[PDB]
Amino acid sequence: AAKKMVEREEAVVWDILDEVIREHPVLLNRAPTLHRLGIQAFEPVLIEG
């Protein structure tokens, strides 16, 4: 039921995602990660697109 509720993409799923994302960082790697600062962690904000 959780799998199909995500794969139906309900508004309760969008609200739950908006609560999960809140201050939980992600690492934006770029390769070729030459020097040390090629991995930085950001707190994501949601956009469409």
């Binding site: 508004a11 969008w14 609200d15 956009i47 469409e48």
Partner: protein, 228 residues
């Protein structure tokens, strides 16, 4: 064909002369419309009164110097321009201040009539070095709207004023700074909306929400003609 009305969600009152009207949500490309319209009205059209002309003894133009003071007459002109006065009944009041003795001269030292008052009495005017120094200035207060500076004031005037009269920029409108952003809010389906954040800092004589409401009703009464 129905439009989104907002709710005014926040007045974060930082100080008594500071506000931040967080405001959400508007249609896509309407935050800039409301913000720019209010900003131009609040800058160059909001009515109010301040000091325009001042006649001081001991000086003949804007680059002379009276004794007994640390600061010079450009500084007394600038600190005079910073003074925020409100006039209730009339619109052309002349005021006169006289100060002698060891100590600074503040805004509470002025002689006031029944119609005028000072919104910040501890706002400094000048300082006095000599106890024998007797400063005297004839402070005229007109009432206009917005901002008119002394440069185009002296370009626009033609009548020969008596020597000793000093021109100053007339900060008629009571706001000091308004600058907004437009952020992006979200109604549960459409993410394309936008949220207004209007910042405002004024002088005395008004409350920032009163200035915002005044500008809004100025524009509404301006557009009151051809509506349905």
């Amino acid at each position: 064909t129905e439009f989104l009305k907002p709710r005014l969600v926040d007045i974060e009152q930082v100080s008594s002369t500071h506000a931040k009207v967080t405001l959400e949500p508007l249609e896509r490309g309407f935050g800039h419309t409301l913000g720019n319209a209010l900003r131009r009205i609040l800058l160059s059209s909001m009515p109010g009164c301040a000091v325009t002309e001042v006649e001081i003894d001991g000086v003949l133009h804007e680059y002379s110097t009276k004794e007994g003071v640390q600061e010079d007459i450009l500084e007394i002109l600038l600190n005079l321009k910073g003074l925020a006065v409100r006039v209730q009944g009339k619109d052309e009041v002349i005021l006169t201040l006289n100060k002698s003795g060891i100590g600074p001269v503040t805004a509470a030292d002025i002689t006031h009539d029944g119609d005028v008052e000072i919104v910040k009495p501890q706002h400094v005017i000048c300082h006095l070095t000599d106890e024998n120094a007797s400063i005297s200035m004839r402070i005229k207060v007109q009432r206009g709207r917005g901002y008119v500076p002394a440069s185009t004031r002296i370009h626009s005037e033609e009548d020969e004023r008596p020597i000793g009269r000093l021109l100053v920029d007339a900060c008629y409108s009571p706001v000091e700074r308004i600058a907004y952003n437009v952020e992006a809010a979200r109604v549960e389906q459409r993410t394309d909306l936008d949220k207004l954040v209007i910042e405002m800092e004024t002088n005395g004589t008004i409350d920032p929400e009163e200035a915002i409401r005044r500008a809004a009703t100025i524009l509404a009464e301006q557009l009151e003609a051809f509506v349905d």
